[PDB]
Every structure is written in C-alpha cells, then in structure tokens.
C-alpha cells in the first residue's frame, strides 16, 4: 500500500485529489495551516471514512515544516500555492516566496528519502504568455515547449504579470533542484478547473466558471480577458485533473510537464449552454456575443499520446455537478 | 524498397497519396479507368519524375481488372469510390455496386499473396448518422465505435442517405472479407478534406471547402447542413490524411477503423478567417451567423494515442494552399 502526500488539503483541487487518492486505496498525508480549524477542514474528517488520512500543520513560508507530512511517502503532490494579489513589490512579496516555498517543500521530499515522484501543480499561466504569438494576429497551437515570457513580463509589467512569472520561475527552479538532487519531478499545467469537490470553503475557479450564473464581476472580467487574448477559454473537469495527476505519478515513463485541458468554448457557446440548462439564473447569451478572433489554443495531445483518458468530454459533462457545488458553497443564491 | 498500390490515381485523395508514397521512397502502382485520358491524368506523367510509378487500367465494376495493379504490392490503398448522385434505385445503382466494387479489389489482394495490409479510405459519413443522438439536445463526442444508422436511413431515406449506407455496408463487408481470408484491413474515416493535390480535374470536397469563396450553392448547402446537424464542421488537411494513411499501413499494431480530423470550426469562424485572409472574394461572415447548437463532434484520440502527429493544426495551416489549387482547377474564377 503506497503513501501519498497532498499539500494544502483545505483547498479546492487538493481536497478533490485527496478523495481520489483514498478511493484508489492510497494512504494519504495532507497539510493545512491550522488543523484545529474544523470549519475550514470539516471535509478532512468525512474523508477519513474512505481510508487512512493524516493531517499535518505546515506552511510553505516556514522552512522544514513539511518534513513530517512528506516522510514515508511514495508520492508528493505539490498543490498548495499562495493566492495572487497586486503587491507593491511582486518580486519580493510573491515571485521569490513562490520559488523559496516550492524549494522548501522540495527539500522535505529529498530529506524523506522515500519519494519516488513529485507531481507539481502549476498552470497554463506558465505556458501561454508569448508576446509574439499573442499579438501577431494569427492562430496558434501551444504545447509544453511554450513558456510564458518572463523577460517581457518583467520589462513591461502588465497587470498580474507576477503570477505568470512566479509559475515559470518556480517550475524552472524546482526542476533544476530535482535534477541536482536526483529526484523525479513531473509538472501538470491545468486550465480553468470545473466541478464539485469536498472542500467546504472553496472559491478559486469555482467563482470564475460560475460567474455567468452569479454575475460576479471579477469572474466575468477573467473570462472576457482570456477570450480577448486567446479567442476562447479552456476548461477541464476537476476529477479529470486529479486522475491526470495520479496518472503522472503512477506511470514511470511520464516525464517533464503536461498541459491538462479538455473543452475550449467561446464565451457565447458557454453562455448559451448555461442559459439553456440553468435558465433560472437569467443568463443572456447576447451579453457575450463577440467577433471571431484567431484561436490561440493549448494542445491536449501530450497526455493523450501517453495513454491518459478524459472522463468529462462534453461541455455538459464538464459542468455536470459544479452548480450544485456553487449552491452549497453560497457562491450561487439558490 | 516496398511497393504499394493506389486505386483511383486520377482522383483528389489518390493523387495526393501517390505523391506522398513516391516521396517516401515507395514504388507505386496506380489504377485509372482510361490511362490515355490526359485531361484527367496529365499529372501521372509529372509524378513519374518523383520515383517508380506505373499506371494500370482497371474498373471497380469490372471483376478482376485490379489483379495486375495489386500484384507484388506490400500495401494497397483503396481510395477509389463511386460518386454519389440521385438514382431512381440507389440500392442497385450506388449501394450494391459500392459493396461489390470493394470486394472486387479485395479479391485481387488475396490473389496477389504479397499484400501485408489494405488501407480503406472511408468517411465520417459512416460514423455520424446517429439519430438516437442528433435530436436529443445534448452534445456528443462520437468515436470509432459509432456507426451511421443503416436501418434508419433506409426507412426514412433523407437526402443522400445512400451515401452513408454505401460507406457503412462496404466497410462492414470488406472487414468480413478480410477476416475470412486472413488479410489485415484498416479503415480511415476523414472529415472534410482541404488542400492542394496533383489531380488536375478534382472536384469533390475542394468544391465544398471553397464554397464560401466561390458561392457554389451545393457546397454551401453541404456546409450549412453539417453545421445544423453537428453545430460545427470538421476539417483535415489532405496531406495529414495521406500521412495518416501511410502511418496506418506502416505501424504493425494499427487495427480497426480510425477517425481522421483536426480542426472543428463553426461556419462563422471559418468565414471570418477566409474573409480576412482572402478579401478578394467578398465573403460576408454575417451570412453564416447561427445560434450555438450542441456539439456533435468527432473524437481525435485514436490516431493520436497510437503515435500519429498532425502537421496542419491551425485553421490557417489547414487552408495553407487550397485557394491556389481551386484557382488552378477553375473552381474559383480568379
Ligand atoms: N482552480 C483552477 O482553475 C486552476 C487552474 C490552473 C492552475 N491551478 C493551480 O492549482 C493549485 C491549487 O489551485 P486551487 O484552485 O485548488 O486554489 P485554492 O483552493 O486556493 O488552494 C490553494 C491552497 O494553497 C494553500 N496555501 C496558500 N498559501 C500557503 C502557505 N503559505 N502554506 C501552505 N499552504 C498555503 C492554501 O491553504 P490556506 O487556506 O491555508 O491558505 C489553499 O488551500 C494552484 O497552484 C493553481 O495555481 C488552478
Ligand atoms: N474529399 C473529402 O472531403 C472526403 C471526406 C470524407 C471521405 N472521403 C473519402 O475519400 C474517397 C476519395 O474521395 P475524393 O475526394 O478523392 O473524390 P474523387 O476526386 O472524385 O476520387 C474518386 C476516384 O474514384 C474513381 N472511381 C469512381 N468509380 C470508379 C470505378 N467504378 N472504377 C474505378 N475507379 C472509379 C474515380 O475515377 P473517374 O474519375 O474516372 O470516375 C475517381 O478518380 C472517397 O471514397 C471519400 O468517400 C473524402
Ligand atoms: O492564464 C489563464 C488561462 C489562460 O491563459 C488560457 C485558458 O484557456 C485558461 C486559463 O485559466 C487560468 C485560470 C483562470 C481562473 C482561475 O481561478 C485559475 O486558477 C486559473 C488563467 O490564469
Ligand atoms: O457526412 C459528411 C460529413 C459530416 O457529416 C461531418 C463532417 O465533419 C464532414 C463530412 O464530410 C463528408 C464528405 C464530404 C465530401 C465528400 O466527397 C465525401 O465523400 C464525404 C460528408 O458526407
């Protein structure tokens, strides 16, 4: 019986991953920042009914605090990550702490002497920002060879530039470290993640993918910004991401970084689907009418090439249970 | 040096397939109905400059005529197929001939004894017609397990029903024949095929994919009918199709049937791209506005999971060279 650690069990994806790991007969270790906070961590007790689940206190800013949680683990899923904000000095308040916090947990993995693979959860935010391809007026298909352009981002500092830089640098730094330390690191790069999860305080991409139904202004801005940039948005169901994470850990031939994405609608397609299946929210699809732009899209081929299979393949399946989740979280009024 | 046969050397796809095979170092043998008709076959002389290419007279209606073309071949590419017209009795003018013509060529393969694999070019017309699904208001991803509903098509005989039936029945029959005689058969199922080819008299899908530029009523009705059914069209570059055909012949473990498709635009996406890139034709994208419908789309996983790679991945790359082909053909007036 193998043992896996999921960092940040309080979080959206982390909670879905812990559940999947238990269903597959893994013993699971997870970290939160206050194990005594049973409002935020009630799901961790329920999940104990599926298999062995142990909770630890750890913080990415606190050197060595992950030592106990990763010890004895065959696999470690680095899911926990700091929330973004507009900081007065993003280099010092975000980019550097994101690198250092990643290395911090990397050290606990080496020290554990038992970790066969580290799976790093990053983001297509580390893939898509390409000044050439985005602005040249042509369509493009990006794959795992594409990296977000740190120099252009440091040089021009568009809003939220530090989020892409942090993902790029922490991935590079963690790979450098894994090479120099003889430990196997594989990285997954999700798009917008949709679907229900055990976490009772989840927000994150649930807010964004539901914003057409809720009217959340920041969610809608995010969706429109992505569409303005790429000609569409990209979605993946949370349970396919979790299955993809497990797949990358269990297949010895897995190597490098992997985009994780499944369905790429325009906002008007997405709004028409939501308006039709969930009319009680009053979506007006014409609010998302738009000119057809060049598609700058993520390729899904690498995971497929290697044998992975997605379970939620239509738009309806990707949205199969997220609305109910939104209601139970209060993100939706009813 | 391996030898391969291609039926219908004077046709769109067959001509492109000869070019690829010669480029790849095959000796090639091809059939046309009248090797002297230079109106239709002037390209064969040009192609002979690329490598060993031999022309043969054969007709699918004429039993045993393919014996000489297929002799000595390692691989046989069944591309030639009867065109679809209205017929007082499609069952006797189109369906049964399509079946018997295929079995005719299959028998020459048995006779030759050299044939390590037959590659049949069929069509997603044998995949998509799923009336249990096309009306249900949900989206669907169809795959190689999906077969067009022969019984329902015979019952209701919608326009062009005999095409899908012909494709389905001749595929099922060739598979049974191949099984009975211990010959390996693999089938490829293209969507709409785009790109330039040697054939000097091609019409076929070149008329369709170009119909927004020429205004050809049949082609436009074709494109619209596909979108009203599936909520999108599906496209592939002729050279990716030819490369997939060669991939399936050469890779031992290839088995069964294979969808071949790469880009799935709406008509309004396609028309916007074409109006921008070829403004001389006067396309108005608003002529193709449509409400978003549920997507009934083709799965791309099978070729990909078995190692194949497409090279024309953007809409623009799929249209990289077809306009100048249509101009040279007269399909486009300028
Ligand atoms: N959701 C998506 O659509 C999506 C898309 C692409 C990439 N991703 C990436 O997947 C990762 C998880 O995403 P998510 O949606 O699950 O967001 P999330 O719900 O906010 O989970 C992130 C977790 O990170 C923990 N964390 C933050 N700072 C920490 C620290 N200093 N020490 C220990 N833990 C800390 C947080 O725990 P606390 O409650 O204690 O703060 C939180 O639970 C992220 O790296 C994200 O960038 C997500
Ligand atoms: N083009 C697409 O978008 C598309 C999409 C899906 C599937 N496909 C499949 O690919 C196949 C090839 O299509 P295509 O686009 O290359 O059309 P095409 O250019 O019209 O090729 C058809 C060839 O078949 C030959 N042929 C017809 N009847 C024959 C017979 N009784 N005996 C011998 N030869 C005969 C024809 O020779 P003659 O000219 O002398 O009659 C012609 O050269 C088709 O079977 C199609 O169903 C194509
Ligand atoms: O860059 C991003 C991005 C993108 O460029 C293209 C695309 O198709 C999807 C995307 O989704 C990412 C995202 C959105 C909302 C979230 O709540 C989240 O965690 C991540 C976003 O950062
Ligand atoms: O059903 C069809 C079809 C479809 O349903 C969906 C799709 O994405 C492409 C398609 O293209 C097929 C086709 C076009 C031209 C031909 O010459 C031919 O033989 C077949 C058509 O029949």
């Amino acid at each position: 019986m193998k043992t896996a650690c999921v960092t940040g069990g309080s979080g959206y994806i982390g909670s879905a991953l812990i559940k999947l790991l238990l269903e597959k007969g893994y013993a699971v270790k997870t970290t939160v920042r206050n194990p005594d906070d049973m409002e935020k961590n009630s799901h961790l007790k329920d999940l104990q009914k599926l298999g062995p689940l142990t909770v630890f206190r750890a913080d990415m800013d606190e050197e060595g605090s992950f030592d106990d949680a990763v010890a004895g683990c065959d696999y470690v899923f680095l899911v926990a990550a700091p929330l973004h904000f507009e900081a007065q000095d993003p280099e010092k308040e975000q980019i550097e702490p994101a690198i250092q916090g990643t290395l911090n947990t990397m050290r606990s993995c080496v020290k554990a002497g038992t970790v066969r693979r580290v799976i790093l959860t990053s983001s297509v935010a580390a893939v898509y920002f390409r000044p050439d391809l985005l602005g040249d007026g042509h369509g493009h298909v990006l794959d795992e060879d594409s990296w977000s352009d740190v120099d252009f981002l440091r040089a021009h500092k568009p809003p939220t530039w530090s989020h892409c830089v942090s993902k790029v640098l922490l991935e590079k730094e963690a790979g450098r470290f894994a090479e120099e330390h003889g430990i196997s690191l594989v990285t997954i790069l999700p798009v917008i993640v949709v679907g229900a999860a055990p976490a009772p305080k989840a927000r994150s991409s649930i807010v964004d993918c539901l914003s057409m139904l809720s009217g959340d202004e920041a969610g809608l801005a995010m969706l429109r910004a992505i569409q303005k940039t790429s000609g569409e948005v990209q979605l993946v169901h949370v349970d396919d991401l979790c299955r993809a994470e497990l797949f990358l850990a269990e297949n010895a031939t897995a190597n490098g970084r992997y985009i994780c994405s499944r369905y790429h609608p325009t906002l008007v397609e997405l709004a028409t689907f939501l308006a039709q299946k969930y009319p009680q929210y009053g979506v007006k699809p014409t609010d998302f009418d738009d000119e057809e732009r060049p598609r700058v899209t993520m390729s899904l081929e690498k995971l497929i090439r290697e044998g992975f299979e997605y379970k939620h393949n239509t738009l309806e399946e990707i949205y199969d249970n997220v609305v109910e989740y939104g209601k139970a979280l209060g993100i939706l009024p009813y």
Side-chain angles (χ1 to χ4, degrees), chain A residues 13 123-126 128-129 163-164 190-193 203-209 222-223 226 229-230 232-235 261 264 296 298:
Chain A
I13 289 158
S123 161
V124 291
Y128 89 104
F129 201 78
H163 174 67
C164 310
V191 293
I192 296 157
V193 177
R203 298 302 185 259
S204 179
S205 69
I206 302 311
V207 173
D208 301 315
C209 72
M222 181 59 90
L223 292 186
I226 289 165
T229 304
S230 299
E232 64 185 27
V233 305
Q234 314 177 55
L235 317 162
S261 172
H264 308 180
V296 184
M298 294 324 148

Short mmCIF file of all heavy atoms in Angstrom, two decimals, chain A residues 13 123-126 128-129 163-164 190-193 203-209 222-223 226 229-230 232-235 261 264 296 298, ligand 3:
data_model
loop_
_atom_site.label_atom_id
_atom_site.label_comp_id
_atom_site.label_asym_id
_atom_site.label_seq_id
_atom_site.Cartn_x
_atom_site.Cartn_y
_atom_site.Cartn_z
N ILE A 13 -8.71 22.00 -5.36
CA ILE A 13 -8.14 20.86 -6.05
C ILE A 13 -7.57 19.85 -5.06
O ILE A 13 -7.78 18.64 -5.19
CB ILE A 13 -7.07 21.33 -7.05
CG1 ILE A 13 -7.73 22.04 -8.24
CG2 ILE A 13 -6.26 20.14 -7.53
CD1 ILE A 13 -6.81 23.03 -9.03
N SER A 123 0.27 25.74 -13.85
CA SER A 123 -0.86 26.35 -14.52
C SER A 123 -0.45 26.69 -15.94
O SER A 123 0.72 26.99 -16.20
CB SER A 123 -1.30 27.62 -13.77
OG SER A 123 -2.07 28.50 -14.55
N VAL A 124 -1.41 26.67 -16.87
CA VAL A 124 -1.15 27.24 -18.19
C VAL A 124 -0.71 28.68 -18.11
O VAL A 124 -0.34 29.25 -19.14
CB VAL A 124 -2.38 27.16 -19.11
CG1 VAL A 124 -2.64 25.70 -19.48
CG2 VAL A 124 -3.58 27.86 -18.46
N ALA A 125 -0.81 29.32 -16.94
CA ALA A 125 -0.26 30.65 -16.80
C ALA A 125 1.23 30.65 -17.09
O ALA A 125 1.79 31.67 -17.51
CB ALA A 125 -0.53 31.20 -15.40
N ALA A 126 1.89 29.51 -16.87
CA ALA A 126 3.30 29.32 -17.19
C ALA A 126 3.54 28.96 -18.65
O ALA A 126 4.69 28.78 -19.04
CB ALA A 126 3.90 28.23 -16.30
N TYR A 128 1.19 30.24 -21.60
CA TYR A 128 0.51 30.98 -22.65
C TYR A 128 1.11 32.34 -22.97
O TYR A 128 0.90 32.83 -24.08
CB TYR A 128 -0.97 31.16 -22.30
CG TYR A 128 -1.27 32.41 -21.49
CD1 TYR A 128 -1.85 33.54 -22.08
CD2 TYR A 128 -0.99 32.46 -20.14
CE1 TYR A 128 -2.13 34.67 -21.33
CE2 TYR A 128 -1.26 33.58 -19.39
CZ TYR A 128 -1.83 34.69 -19.98
OH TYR A 128 -2.08 35.80 -19.20
N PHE A 129 1.80 33.01 -22.04
CA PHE A 129 2.14 34.40 -22.31
C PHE A 129 3.33 34.48 -23.26
O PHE A 129 4.49 34.39 -22.86
CB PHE A 129 2.41 35.21 -21.04
CG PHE A 129 2.25 36.68 -21.27
CD1 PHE A 129 0.99 37.25 -21.33
CD2 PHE A 129 3.36 37.48 -21.56
CE1 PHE A 129 0.83 38.62 -21.61
CE2 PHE A 129 3.21 38.84 -21.83
CZ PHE A 129 1.94 39.41 -21.86
N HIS A 163 2.05 36.81 -11.67
CA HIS A 163 1.52 35.46 -11.49
C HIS A 163 2.17 34.49 -12.48
O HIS A 163 2.65 33.42 -12.08
CB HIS A 163 -0.01 35.47 -11.63
CG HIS A 163 -0.62 34.11 -11.61
ND1 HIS A 163 -0.62 33.30 -10.49
CD2 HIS A 163 -1.23 33.39 -12.59
CE1 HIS A 163 -1.22 32.15 -10.77
NE2 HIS A 163 -1.60 32.19 -12.04
N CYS A 164 2.23 34.86 -13.77
CA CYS A 164 2.94 34.02 -14.74
C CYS A 164 4.41 33.86 -14.40
O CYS A 164 4.97 32.77 -14.53
CB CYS A 164 2.80 34.57 -16.17
SG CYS A 164 1.15 34.98 -16.71
N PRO A 190 -2.81 22.91 -15.51
CA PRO A 190 -4.26 22.96 -15.76
C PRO A 190 -4.72 24.28 -16.36
O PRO A 190 -4.13 25.34 -16.14
CB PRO A 190 -4.87 22.81 -14.35
CG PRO A 190 -3.75 22.40 -13.46
CD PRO A 190 -2.48 22.88 -14.08
N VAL A 191 -5.84 24.21 -17.09
CA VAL A 191 -6.63 25.37 -17.48
C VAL A 191 -7.65 25.67 -16.38
O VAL A 191 -7.47 25.23 -15.24
CB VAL A 191 -7.30 25.13 -18.85
CG1 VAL A 191 -6.21 25.05 -19.93
CG2 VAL A 191 -8.13 23.84 -18.83
N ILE A 192 -8.72 26.42 -16.68
CA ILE A 192 -9.76 26.63 -15.67
C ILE A 192 -10.37 25.29 -15.26
O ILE A 192 -10.78 24.49 -16.11
CB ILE A 192 -10.84 27.58 -16.20
CG1 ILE A 192 -10.26 28.96 -16.46
CG2 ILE A 192 -11.99 27.69 -15.21
CD1 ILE A 192 -11.06 29.73 -17.44
N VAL A 193 -10.42 25.04 -13.95
CA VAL A 193 -10.86 23.76 -13.40
C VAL A 193 -12.30 23.89 -12.91
O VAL A 193 -12.62 24.80 -12.13
CB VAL A 193 -9.93 23.30 -12.27
CG1 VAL A 193 -10.44 22.00 -11.64
CG2 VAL A 193 -8.53 23.12 -12.79
N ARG A 203 -13.25 28.52 -3.16
CA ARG A 203 -13.62 29.63 -4.05
C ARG A 203 -12.90 29.43 -5.38
O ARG A 203 -13.33 28.62 -6.21
CB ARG A 203 -13.28 30.99 -3.43
CG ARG A 203 -14.02 31.27 -2.14
CD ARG A 203 -15.53 31.21 -2.36
NE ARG A 203 -16.26 31.59 -1.16
CZ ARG A 203 -16.83 30.74 -0.32
NH1 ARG A 203 -16.81 29.43 -0.53
NH2 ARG A 203 -17.43 31.21 0.77
N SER A 204 -11.80 30.14 -5.60
CA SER A 204 -10.89 29.79 -6.68
C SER A 204 -11.63 29.77 -8.01
O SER A 204 -12.43 30.67 -8.29
CB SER A 204 -10.22 28.44 -6.37
OG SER A 204 -9.33 28.05 -7.41
N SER A 205 -11.41 28.75 -8.83
CA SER A 205 -12.01 28.79 -10.16
C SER A 205 -13.49 28.47 -10.14
O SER A 205 -14.15 28.64 -11.17
CB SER A 205 -11.27 27.85 -11.11
OG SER A 205 -11.48 26.49 -10.78
N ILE A 206 -14.04 28.00 -9.01
CA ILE A 206 -15.48 27.87 -8.92
C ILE A 206 -16.13 29.24 -9.13
O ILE A 206 -17.14 29.37 -9.83
CB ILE A 206 -15.89 27.23 -7.59
CG1 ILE A 206 -15.23 25.86 -7.43
CG2 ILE A 206 -17.41 27.04 -7.55
CD1 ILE A 206 -15.40 24.99 -8.68
N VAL A 207 -15.53 30.29 -8.57
CA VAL A 207 -16.09 31.63 -8.75
C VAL A 207 -16.10 32.00 -10.23
O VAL A 207 -17.10 32.51 -10.76
CB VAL A 207 -15.30 32.66 -7.92
CG1 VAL A 207 -15.77 34.08 -8.25
CG2 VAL A 207 -15.46 32.37 -6.44
N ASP A 208 -14.99 31.75 -10.92
CA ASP A 208 -14.87 32.16 -12.31
C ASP A 208 -15.80 31.35 -13.21
O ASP A 208 -16.51 31.91 -14.05
CB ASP A 208 -13.42 32.01 -12.75
CG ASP A 208 -12.47 32.85 -11.91
OD1 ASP A 208 -12.80 34.03 -11.65
OD2 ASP A 208 -11.43 32.33 -11.46
N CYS A 209 -15.82 30.02 -13.05
CA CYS A 209 -16.55 29.24 -14.04
C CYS A 209 -18.05 29.38 -13.86
O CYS A 209 -18.80 29.11 -14.80
CB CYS A 209 -16.13 27.78 -14.00
SG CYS A 209 -16.73 26.92 -12.56
N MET A 222 -12.33 38.02 -15.77
CA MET A 222 -11.35 36.97 -16.07
C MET A 222 -11.73 36.22 -17.35
O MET A 222 -10.89 36.04 -18.25
CB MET A 222 -11.22 36.02 -14.88
CG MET A 222 -10.20 34.88 -15.05
SD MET A 222 -8.48 35.41 -15.35
CE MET A 222 -7.89 35.53 -13.66
N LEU A 223 -13.00 35.80 -17.45
CA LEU A 223 -13.44 35.05 -18.63
C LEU A 223 -13.29 35.89 -19.89
O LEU A 223 -12.84 35.38 -20.92
CB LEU A 223 -14.90 34.60 -18.46
CG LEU A 223 -15.17 33.54 -17.38
CD1 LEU A 223 -16.62 33.04 -17.38
CD2 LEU A 223 -14.21 32.36 -17.56
N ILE A 226 -9.56 36.35 -20.88
CA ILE A 226 -8.98 35.17 -21.51
C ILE A 226 -9.48 35.05 -22.94
O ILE A 226 -8.70 34.76 -23.86
CB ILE A 226 -9.30 33.90 -20.69
CG1 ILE A 226 -8.51 33.88 -19.38
CG2 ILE A 226 -9.02 32.63 -21.55
CD1 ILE A 226 -9.02 32.86 -18.36
N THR A 229 -7.86 37.45 -25.25
CA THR A 229 -6.49 37.07 -25.55
C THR A 229 -6.42 35.87 -26.48
O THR A 229 -5.67 35.88 -27.46
CB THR A 229 -5.77 36.76 -24.24
OG1 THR A 229 -5.86 37.90 -23.39
CG2 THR A 229 -4.30 36.46 -24.49
N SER A 230 -7.18 34.81 -26.20
CA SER A 230 -6.98 33.55 -26.90
C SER A 230 -8.08 33.18 -27.89
O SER A 230 -7.92 32.21 -28.64
CB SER A 230 -6.80 32.42 -25.87
OG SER A 230 -5.65 32.70 -25.08
N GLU A 232 -11.06 32.21 -27.04
CA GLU A 232 -11.84 31.15 -26.41
C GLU A 232 -11.35 31.00 -24.98
O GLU A 232 -10.44 31.72 -24.56
CB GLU A 232 -11.65 29.84 -27.19
CG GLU A 232 -10.18 29.36 -27.13
CD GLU A 232 -9.87 28.11 -27.98
OE1 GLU A 232 -10.56 27.84 -29.01
OE2 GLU A 232 -8.93 27.38 -27.59
N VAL A 233 -11.95 30.10 -24.20
CA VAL A 233 -11.42 29.71 -22.90
C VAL A 233 -11.20 28.20 -22.93
O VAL A 233 -11.64 27.49 -23.84
CB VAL A 233 -12.33 30.12 -21.72
CG1 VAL A 233 -12.60 31.61 -21.76
CG2 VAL A 233 -13.65 29.35 -21.73
N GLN A 234 -10.48 27.71 -21.94
CA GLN A 234 -10.21 26.28 -21.85
C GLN A 234 -10.57 25.80 -20.45
O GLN A 234 -10.27 26.47 -19.46
CB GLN A 234 -8.77 25.99 -22.23
CG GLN A 234 -8.48 26.76 -23.50
CD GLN A 234 -7.06 26.65 -23.99
OE1 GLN A 234 -6.54 25.55 -24.21
NE2 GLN A 234 -6.41 27.82 -24.18
N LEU A 235 -11.28 24.67 -20.41
CA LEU A 235 -11.82 24.09 -19.20
C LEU A 235 -11.38 22.63 -19.11
O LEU A 235 -11.12 21.98 -20.13
CB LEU A 235 -13.34 24.15 -19.18
CG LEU A 235 -13.91 25.48 -19.64
CD1 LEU A 235 -15.38 25.34 -20.01
CD2 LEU A 235 -13.73 26.50 -18.53
N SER A 261 -6.22 19.92 -20.12
CA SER A 261 -7.32 20.70 -20.66
C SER A 261 -8.19 19.75 -21.48
O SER A 261 -7.70 18.73 -21.97
CB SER A 261 -6.79 21.86 -21.52
OG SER A 261 -7.85 22.51 -22.20
N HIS A 264 -12.82 23.64 -25.09
CA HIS A 264 -12.39 25.01 -25.40
C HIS A 264 -13.53 25.78 -26.06
O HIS A 264 -13.54 25.98 -27.29
CB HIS A 264 -11.17 25.00 -26.32
CG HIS A 264 -10.04 24.16 -25.80
ND1 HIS A 264 -8.85 24.00 -26.48
CD2 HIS A 264 -9.93 23.41 -24.68
CE1 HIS A 264 -8.06 23.20 -25.79
NE2 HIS A 264 -8.69 22.82 -24.69
N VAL A 296 -5.85 31.04 -30.15
CA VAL A 296 -4.57 30.69 -29.57
C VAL A 296 -4.88 29.66 -28.49
O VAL A 296 -5.34 30.00 -27.39
CB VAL A 296 -3.82 31.90 -29.01
CG1 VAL A 296 -2.49 31.46 -28.51
CG2 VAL A 296 -3.65 32.98 -30.09
N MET A 298 -4.38 25.76 -26.34
CA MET A 298 -3.49 24.78 -25.74
C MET A 298 -3.70 23.43 -26.39
O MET A 298 -4.85 23.02 -26.63
CB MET A 298 -3.77 24.61 -24.25
CG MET A 298 -3.50 25.77 -23.33
SD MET A 298 -2.12 26.84 -23.66
CE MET A 298 -2.75 28.38 -23.06
O1 LIG C 3 -3.94 32.05 -17.66
C1 LIG C 3 -5.02 31.56 -17.51
C2 LIG C 3 -5.70 30.86 -18.65
C3 LIG C 3 -5.32 31.07 -19.99
O2 LIG C 3 -4.29 31.96 -20.31
C4 LIG C 3 -5.98 30.39 -21.03
C5 LIG C 3 -7.01 29.49 -20.72
O3 LIG C 3 -7.66 28.81 -21.73
C6 LIG C 3 -7.38 29.27 -19.39
C7 LIG C 3 -6.71 29.97 -18.35
O4 LIG C 3 -7.09 29.75 -16.88
C8 LIG C 3 -6.24 30.23 -15.80
C9 LIG C 3 -7.07 30.34 -14.55
C10 LIG C 3 -8.30 31.00 -14.55
C11 LIG C 3 -9.07 31.10 -13.36
C12 LIG C 3 -8.61 30.54 -12.18
O5 LIG C 3 -9.38 30.65 -10.97
C13 LIG C 3 -7.36 29.89 -12.20
O6 LIG C 3 -6.83 29.31 -11.01
C14 LIG C 3 -6.61 29.79 -13.37
C15 LIG C 3 -5.67 31.60 -16.20
O7 LIG C 3 -4.62 32.06 -15.25
#
